[PDB]
Amino acid sequence: RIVVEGLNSCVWVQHHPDRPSIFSRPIIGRYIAAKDAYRNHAYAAYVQNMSVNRTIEVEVPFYQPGLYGMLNASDNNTANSFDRLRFTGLGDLLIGIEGEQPIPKE
Amino acid sequence: RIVVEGLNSCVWVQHHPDRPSIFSRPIIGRYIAAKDAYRNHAYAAYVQNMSVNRTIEVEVPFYQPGLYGMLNASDNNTANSFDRLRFTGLGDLLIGIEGEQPIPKE
Amino acid sequence: GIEISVYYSIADDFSFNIFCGFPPMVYCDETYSAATPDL
Amino acid sequence: DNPPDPTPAKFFVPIPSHSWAHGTNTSEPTNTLRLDGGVVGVGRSDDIGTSDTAISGIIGVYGLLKPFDWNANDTGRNVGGHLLWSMPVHPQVDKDQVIQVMTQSKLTQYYLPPISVVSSLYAYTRGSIKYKFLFGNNPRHNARLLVAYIPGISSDNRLTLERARNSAHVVFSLNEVSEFVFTVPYITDTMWWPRKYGGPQAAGEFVAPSYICMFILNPLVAMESVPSIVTIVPMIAAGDDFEVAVPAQPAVGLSRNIDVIYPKDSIISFKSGYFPVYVGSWHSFFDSTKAILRYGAVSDHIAQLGNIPANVNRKAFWIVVGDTIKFKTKLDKINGTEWFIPEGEYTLGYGVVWRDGAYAYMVPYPLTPLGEKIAQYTASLLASNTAISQIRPYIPDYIVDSAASKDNILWSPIEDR
Amino acid sequence: DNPPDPTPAKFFVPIPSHSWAHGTNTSEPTNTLRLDGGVVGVGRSDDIGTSDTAISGIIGVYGLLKPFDWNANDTGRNVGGHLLWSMPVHPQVDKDQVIQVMTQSKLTQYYLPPISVVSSLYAYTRGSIKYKFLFGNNPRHNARLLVAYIPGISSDNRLTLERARNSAHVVFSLNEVSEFVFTVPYITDTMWWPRKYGGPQAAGEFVAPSYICMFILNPLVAMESVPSIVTIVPMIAAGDDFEVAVPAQPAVGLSRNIDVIYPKDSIISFKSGYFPVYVGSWHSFFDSTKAILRYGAVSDHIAQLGNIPANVNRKAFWIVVGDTIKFKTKLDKINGTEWFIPEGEYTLGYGVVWRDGAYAYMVPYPLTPLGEKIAQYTASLLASNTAISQIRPYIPDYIVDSAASKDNILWSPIEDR
Amino acid sequence: DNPPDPTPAKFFVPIPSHSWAHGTNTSEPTNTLRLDGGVVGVGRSDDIGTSDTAISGIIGVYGLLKPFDWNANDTGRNVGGHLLWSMPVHPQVDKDQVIQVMTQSKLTQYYLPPISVVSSLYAYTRGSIKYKFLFGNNPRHNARLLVAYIPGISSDNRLTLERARNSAHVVFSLNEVSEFVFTVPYITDTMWWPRKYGGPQAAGEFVAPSYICMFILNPLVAMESVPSIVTIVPMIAAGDDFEVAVPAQPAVGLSRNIDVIYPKDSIISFKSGYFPVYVGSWHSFFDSTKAILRYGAVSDHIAQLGNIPANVNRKAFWIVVGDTIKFKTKLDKINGTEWFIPEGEYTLGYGVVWRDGAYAYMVPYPLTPLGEKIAQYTASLLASNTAISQIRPYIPDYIVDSAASKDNILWSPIEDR
Amino acid sequence: DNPPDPTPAKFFVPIPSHSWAHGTNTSEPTNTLRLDGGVVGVGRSDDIGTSDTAISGIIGVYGLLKPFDWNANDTGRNVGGHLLWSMPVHPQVDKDQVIQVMTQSKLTQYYLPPISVVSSLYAYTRGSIKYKFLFGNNPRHNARLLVAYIPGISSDNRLTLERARNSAHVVFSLNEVSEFVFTVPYITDTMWWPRKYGGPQAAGEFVAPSYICMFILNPLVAMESVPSIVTIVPMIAAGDDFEVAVPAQPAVGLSRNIDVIYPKDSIISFKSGYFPVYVGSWHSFFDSTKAILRYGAVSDHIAQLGNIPANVNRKAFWIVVGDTIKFKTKLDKINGTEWFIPEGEYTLGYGVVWRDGAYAYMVPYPLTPLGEKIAQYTASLLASNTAISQIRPYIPDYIVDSAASKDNILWSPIEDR
């Protein structure tokens, strides 16, 4: 459930099941690589105008090639990078803005 | 699905099945000829206030005189202008504004 | 500022259970008098 | 497959909330703060009864009213035809027939019976009322009483035994009997009767429809080896035919907090230099035998009141808000009433405005339920331009100058029935 | 009882209005301005028919087309093999085959048949067309005609009787017969055929798929006691197999208001000091035998046009917008056509731009349907750099200088098929 | 056909989201990010079990508690009636009965059993608890223990064997037996019992209802060819009758990140010029035999604390936040307790404020679980104005001046049960 | 009649649009732009097939892979045990095993087979793959090949015939046979296998699970009256057991527009005054036998690169973006590879950065698929600090100074597997 306050523009949300992060911390704004910073095609998505509702409700599916996904995984993992890369997280969720409206100083 | 952000006015949408473009690029604003720049009568249309919803949902029908419509058609086509003109595109979709509200500087 | 107004009521599963006495009361007509009928 | 759904949209009207008034015979959508998202309700057992909020079971419980003494040796009062006790009949009891607790600068606490409390929650009322009378006697005492229900009468101004017998009434014998109930009728020209006490500034108030009166048929007799006084304790409950119509602003509030802020716009006081004040006498007012507030011992030095707003009712008396004083006064019994003030030290709680030309003076009254009544009656007499000589017996007497006030004294306008 | 309703809220999408396009096979929620809040509809009886908007019943009604004379004494035209009448076949009739009314500075009014009016409301069309031919004859007249339907041909450029007989055709005998119908086929390489006339700036326009032509098999014969001219009135209706596909911008508008505001950006005129203008001659233009617009009688004083925008099509001729002038001109019949202008006084309605270096001049044309055609053809000849000697017969002749204009004359760009 | 739909619009209430609290017995509308738009759920097989989140199956698993040694040669402790081990009974174990790991400037890590972890997620709890006792013995060792469950007692202040036998208890024989379980009862004056540990600032915390105690009936015996120490490892699990009522703020957090930012407003330190500090002695404090923090070697040079806010509880001791120091101290065993600090080098982790007039001084304590207890007890003794001579045995001894700090030392207020 | 409707309003949640992700197994409300307001769909017949988008029918169609020649007269290569052809097995083919078209400053066009195109639309894949091998032979040619599927191997670094025979393999005889199919297995440690090529900046990319290799068992034989070269054309299709799991960003784009704007922030060039540049030699770099970019003919005048950002991978080589130059170079065949550049004039497309202290120089490479590989390999050798003498054979030779550039040359960072 994404709650966005202070923005009068439109919000887009994508799910990248084949691209999950190997770190347990989010990446913000201008630090996001181009491959993710912009809307990708063909991914399951939802686009919502804040004018109608400021709360987004989505369900993210399990799209992993294996039997299980690992719980409580370490970010320091070099001996099993493959496990940490594709058998741990559901895939990154990206939340972006779609409009020309400026962001308030707050 | 037309998503219009930044405008507080009303949006009108028309479908011109008998007038499809022979180019694979859109035409914007003051470059649109009068025949299309203004609302035409009797065409299937939908008029939506942005105050109620900033997303427009329409389905454009197939109104072509032939058996098939051509996929992947060339813009450089003089030997078969007729095919390119009326047996290729579903007809232009025009998106306009209906109100006196000024457009923000963004 | 912002104003927050909380209204409340009894739910459907609620019960006022053991009847003891009422306590002594005050009268609302003894707050603002009718000596000034409009005020 | 992705079939289109061109079913026409419906017109709907958005509203921010569900019903605020409905309390029965309807569902209420809401967001329950639970883990279980169904229709959930707290568990129960015999350890926990069902709600005991059924009205009839509440208002059926007797409540106590102001008791009174019945003296067999009173050769004046203990005679045939004498009115012992009387009041209007309505579910809320008259305020002066209920046990009270007064607090200086605060609100009075009333010990209302269950039928009175519940009735103050509703706008209308109807039905029979059970008046239980409990007597403090033993097998030596004897008397006969006539209690009557007078429809369409609110006071005892024209009430005599020989008239009371011409309405619905009962005759009780006190011969080795200590309790009896007089279930009075409901006689009205309409089906529901509006409550008497309502809201602030007498909002939605009205009057009682009928009167109950207790007369002495055969006077109380005792003997020499037995108490000559018999106390009578009146109690009240709803009859089996009693009903309450319509939810309204409660006529009552709890007594957990008896604080009140009187309107600042109505407050009056003494002009500057005309306070501190004390209770005393001066010659031009009944030859200095009555009490008034002075600001000094030189004469014609009678405390003057500040500007009195014109929106204040002419028949209104006043109540002290801030600090006050104590003073010794008295009042002899007034003809045709049981109104008297024994000689004692009383706090100053009430006042009545005495006008003399462009000057306004204030007359002191004791902070006592009877002082409240005498103050009100006096204000009414000044309102009808009653003879100065006929208002004299309703004014507290002058005994001796009292202590002075710390500073000015503030008064607020009030008015009773 | 006040049970909670924790039923989950549904997701709904708010939209401001119901369908704008739907006109059949659906309900439409709306706020009816009535006292009766149900499904209400105005009352009816036999006095009031049902809606007569069934298309087939409308387009089945014959409409009149431009009539023509058939002269038995014309030893030149009234011969075997001669083409009397011909046009493309499509539901809207060609504009030049329909009765017209022109208005200076306004729009032309066309008397379109029912099949033509209805078809202008829809994008596609198909089916057979009934061409009824009515002859103004009596039992003395006789002839035989061959009318043909030529699929895939839009003009008579390669059309002869001896070719027309090689397509679907009929042979009519005028022997004591005055009416007959030629229900022509629908022969196309596709199922629906796009309408010919569309919207402003030729929006969504196209061409006709086939051609109908009337040839003289056996020439008209009359006698000396009988009219030598037989008028022929063509009429048109939809066949039983006729259909109309898709709602589009009407190709037509009502004639209640024939006003029109031509785009200001396209308007051209004469440079300052080069007006008022008049129609005259000068030597360097076909030895001053043809008409041009001059601004004075000194020579090389030929009115010059202002800046002509580059977005104006090269094959376009012009139409006068504001005030205009009358002028006397003529044009002799051109070889291979029925194109001639009798010597008369005509209003100036059309113009063609004649370029000579950095100077642009304007050639006048009469406000007449034939003048419109000759003007267009001339503009096309200048477009292909046709020999100056071969454009000569398409230019109105000089007779005498005409009146001058009040002031400048304004022109607007137009173009025909 | 286009029939009107005048069906009245319904009143609806717009809300931005569905239930946030509901987790069972309800549907949840949502936008599924899938290609299949129906009710979809990930595939399964025997390779992938069902969710193992059934509480009873989790809290049934035994967790280890703080072990202890049981020395047969201790002629002082290994006697009849001696209390070996005791603690309050509640699902979360007491913090001092659980294996710990402390980190300077960080949070302590506790090895909580499954029944303890799950219980910290819920507000209430009830039922029997299985206390399994594992003994490190072999067939030579023998003893008899009496373990008791004392309802309504939280400490051993009045606890003796000869009293413990007067509550629910069991008697275990260690004769060739190494494991046994004592399933203790649930004896309460109410049905659910509030959890002991809650949230930040002791949010919603309470106390345990009962006590478990292990007494020596027949003392441990060994032989010369056999270990004289028998370790006892207590373990805990939920009984079959155990239940958990109500979701609340977890009393616990993960140990992946044990960082914590103490409130800046509560931080205290030494006044400028009164640091760096070191541990030492001075005469006016128990003849310089106890440890205090000095800022120099001249006497009456005892580090002074800055302003101490009045909102800090009087019974509170302190914990070092930033850099700290190591110091050599000792404390001899205190009468009636197992409280002693062997002579060693310890890091400075805790402090207690010693007030002398307008000056406030700080007493150092070792960063050790026992040092935490002694520091707290001392702060409490200063709170009740206990005799200066009776607080003396609870203060670490002075051995030798220690290293100085790099700079000032920061302290934060804390308080235990 | 106008009955009230006090039915409680329902809670509803407003959202601006319907599902964006759902493409099957659900309805989609929408405003159809039609005249018919029901569930309408375009008409059909046998003239118009049903959608042919069933995946299995698409990926079953064979696509062509990079062909290769098989020379019978090559006494060096045409021997037993020789590796003719090999690559990793995955649905997308390796880029270097697919027909290509390169464009200077634009993107490369790849001729991907149907199984490769479809797979680039989905995230996961699994199943058998049909490798059809077509041979350009006639009845004179003969040989025997051993093709193998090596699970868990991605390269031929440890691959020999005598090892390949120890995995799933087939042995084909070329005796009057021109076509055969090798349906390879799917051998994985998991059920779905992630696609190899993903999105921009190698988004979501991974590696292939297995390897296919073709070995010479019995060498190709021909005769003197017959072609000595036999071409082999590999083709690929999905097996009947092939499946595709999950929609993702297409790994591919159309070739209608092969324009691309490389990030301006990554662009590097030569310092001012160090351009125009040309390809030449200098002594301190392998005795001036290798090609480098110079800015003049005086020595130690080797073009210097501007500031190279630190975020650029150390193993990355470069590609020219703007205008470029042509230059004549060569490279002799490197031991253990089929890597050689014949002596010819090539365009400059790639570069590798050669660092010498605080100065950075650029080494030129030809715009050719093999030049791309050699450039990458060289950059990797510089990355591991390989001996300067061992990188020498991977650098293009110096033949003669080439033309100069018009101005500076711009380079962009790239990196391959």
Picking from D318, D300, D280, D281, the residue whose alpha carbon sits closest to that of residue D411 is: D318
Strands (E), E188-303: 193-194, 210-221, 229-238, 243-244, 278-280, 292-294
CA–CA gap between residue A6 and residue A54 (Å, rounded):
9
Contact call for F29 and A53, based on CB within 8 A? no
3-state SS assignment for residue E106: coil
Find out whether D212 and D89 touch, Cβ atoms under 8 Å.
yes
Min distance F2 CA to chain E CA atoms (Å): 5
Tokens 């041009």 appear where? E292
Q: Which residues 10-29 on chain A approach chain B with CB closer than 8 angstroms?
A: 10
Phi, psi of D162 (to 5 degrees): -75, -5
DSSP class per residue in G200-216:
GGGBT----SEEEEEEE
Is cis: bond before D276, omega within 30 of 0? yes
DSSP annotation of B84: H
Out of A33, A41, A63, the one facing G123 most closely (by C-beta) is: A63
CA–CA gap between residue A46 and residue A56 (Å, rounded):
9
CA B65 → CA B80, D220, E19, E152, G35, distances in Å?
A: 16, 117, 26, 17, 17
Pairs of residues, one from chain D and one from chain E, whose beta carbons lie less than 8 Å apart? 48
DSSP class per residue in G304-369:
-B----TTS-TT-EEEE-S---EEEEEEPPPTTS---EEEEEEEEEEEEEEEETTEEEEEEEESSH
Instruction: Give the list of residues 6+ apart from residue D177 with CB closer than 8 angstroms, or none.
Output: D135
CA–CA gap between residue D341 and residue E170 (Å, rounded):
134
3-state SS assignment for residue G187: coil
In the structure encoding, which two tokens stand for residue G133, read together? 């091998």
CA–CA gap between residue D119 and residue D243 (Å, rounded):
9
Find out whether D305 and D355 touch, Cβ atoms under 8 Å.
no
F124 DSSP β-pair partners: F194
Residues on chain E touching C11 (C-beta within 8 angstroms)? 2, 4
Picking from E362, E342, E339, the residue whose alpha carbon sits closest to that of residue E350 is: E362
Find out whether D350 and D365 touch, Cβ atoms under 8 Å.
yes
Out of G15, G192, G204, the one facing A19 most closely (by C-beta) is: G204
CA–CA gap between residue F270 and residue F15 (Å, rounded):
55
Rounded to 5°, angle at Cα E280 from E274 and E285: 95
Instruction: Give the list of residues 6+ apart from residue D389 with CB closer than 8 angstroms, or none.
Output: none
Find out whether E193 and B65 touch, Cβ atoms under 8 Å.
yes
Find out whether D125 and D196 touch, Cβ atoms under 8 Å.
no
3-state SS assignment for residue D316: coil
DSSP annotation of A72: S
CA–CA gap between residue E328 and residue E345 (Å, rounded):
4
Strand pairing category for F10-14 and F179-184: unpaired
F2–chain D Cβ distance below 8 A for any pair: no
In the structure encoding, which two tokens stand for residue B13, read together? 């949408």
G31 DSSP β-pair partners: B58
Show which subunits contact C, needing at least 3 CB pairs below 8 angstroms: D, E
E216 DSSP β-pair partners: E145
In the structure encoding, which two tokens stand for residue E81, read together? 């093999």
Out of G32, G34, G48, the one facing B68 most closely (by C-beta) is: G48
The length of chain A is 106
CA–CA gap between residue F318 and residue F376 (Å, rounded):
9
DSSP class per residue in F138-198:
-TT-EEEEEEEEEET--SSTT--HHHHTTSEEEEEE-SS--EEEEEE----SSSSEE-S--
CA–CA gap between residue A65 and residue G204 (Å, rounded):
13
Contact call for E22 and F2, based on CB within 8 A? yes
Strands (E), E265-366: 278-280, 292-294, 317-320, 326-331, 341-356, 359-366
Contact call for G38 and E21, based on CB within 8 A? no
CA–CA gap between residue F181 and residue F132 (Å, rounded):
4
Q: CB atoms < 10 A from the CB of E380, how many?
A: 19
In the structure encoding, which two tokens stand for residue D340, read together? 């008297």
DSSP annotation of G375: H
In the structure encoding, which two tokens stand for residue D366, read together? 């004791």
CA–CA gap between residue G229 and residue G239 (Å, rounded):
31
- Which sign, positive or negative, has the C-alpha torsion D76, D82, D87, D88? negative
Picking from F402, F346, F405, the residue whose alpha carbon sits closest to that of residue F375 is: F346
3-state SS assignment for residue D247: strand
Q: Starting at the edge strand that comes first in sequence, how are the strands of the sheet with G10-14 ordered? A: D12-14, F10-14, G10-14, E10-12
Picking from B67, B9, A28, B42, the residue whose alpha carbon sits closest to that of residue B95 is: B9
CA–CA gap between residue G383 and residue A24 (Å, rounded):
30
Strand pairing category for D12-14 and F10-14: parallel
CB hemisphere CA count around F156 (13 angstroms): 19
Q: In angstroms, how far is CA D313 from the centroid of its own chain? A: 20
Min distance D10 CA to chain F CA atoms (Å): 7
Picking from F344, F325, F313, F331, the residue whose alpha carbon sits closest to that of residue F415 is: F313
Picking from B80, A38, B89, B24, the residue whose alpha carbon sits closest to that of residue G256 is: B24
Amino acid at position F380, single letter: S
Picking from E105, E26, E154, the residue whose alpha carbon sits closest to that of residue E410 is: E105
Tokens 């170079």 appear where? G329
Residues on chain A touching F17 (C-beta within 8 angstroms)? 1, 55, 57
Q: CB atoms < 10 A from the CB of E265, how many?
A: 7
Out of A9, A52, A100, the one facing B53 most closely (by C-beta) is: A52
Contact call for F13 and D13, based on CB within 8 A? no
Residues on chain A touching G16 (C-beta within 8 angstroms)? 48-49, 51-53
CB hemisphere CA count around A67 (13 angstroms): 8
E42–chain F Cβ distance below 8 A for any pair: no
CA–CA gap between residue G26 and residue E215 (Å, rounded):
63
G46–chain E Cβ distance below 8 A for any pair: no
Picking from E144, E140, E143, the residue whose alpha carbon sits closest to that of residue E222 is: E140
In the structure encoding, which two tokens stand for residue D63, read together? 């409540």
H helix intervals, G146-295: 161-164
Out of E5, E7, E23, the one facing G35 most closely (by C-beta) is: E23
Tokens 């306009």 appear where? B96
Out of B47, B67, B86, the one facing E17 most closely (by C-beta) is: B47
Q: Resolution in A, one decimal?
A: 2.6
Min distance D8 CA to chain E CA atoms (Å): 7
Query: CA-CA-CA-CA torsion for E252, E258, E263, E267, nearest 10 degrees?
Result: 130
3-state SS assignment for residue D278: strand
Strands (E), D37-128: 63-64, 68-71, 83-89, 100-101, 109-110, 124-126
Find out whether F12 and D12 touch, Cβ atoms under 8 Å.
yes
DSSP annotation of F391: H
Instruction: Give the list of residues 6+ apart from residue E363 with CB closer than 8 angstroms, or none.
Output: E290, E291, E292, E293, E351, E352, E353, E354, E378, E395, E396
DSSP annotation of D270: B
DSSP class per residue in E117-158:
HHHTTBSEEES-EEEEEEE---TT-EEEEEEEEEET--SSTT
Q: CB atoms < 10 A from the CB of G31, how many?
A: 25
- Which sign, positive or negative, has the C-alpha torsion F243, F246, F251, F257? positive
In the structure encoding, which two tokens stand for residue G224, read together? 């003197």
Find out whether D130 and D63 touch, Cβ atoms under 8 Å.
no
Rounded to 5°, angle at Cα D315 from D314 and D319: 105
CA–CA gap between residue E116 and residue E91 (Å, rounded):
5
Please name the helix (run of DSSP H) or strand (run of DSSP E) that holds residue F343, with its range, or none.
strand F341-356
Find out whether G141 and G212 touch, Cβ atoms under 8 Å.
no
Tokens 């649109």 appear where? B32
Contact call for F30 and A60, based on CB within 8 A? no
F14–chain G Cβ distance below 8 A for any pair: yes
Tokens 């007030």 appear where? F355
CA–CA gap between residue G143 and residue G138 (Å, rounded):
12
Q: CB atoms < 10 A from the CB of F238, how many?
A: 26
Residue ranges per structural domain of chain G? 54-260, 264-415
Query: CA-CA-CA-CA torsion for E30, E34, E38, E39, nearest 10 degrees?
Result: -70
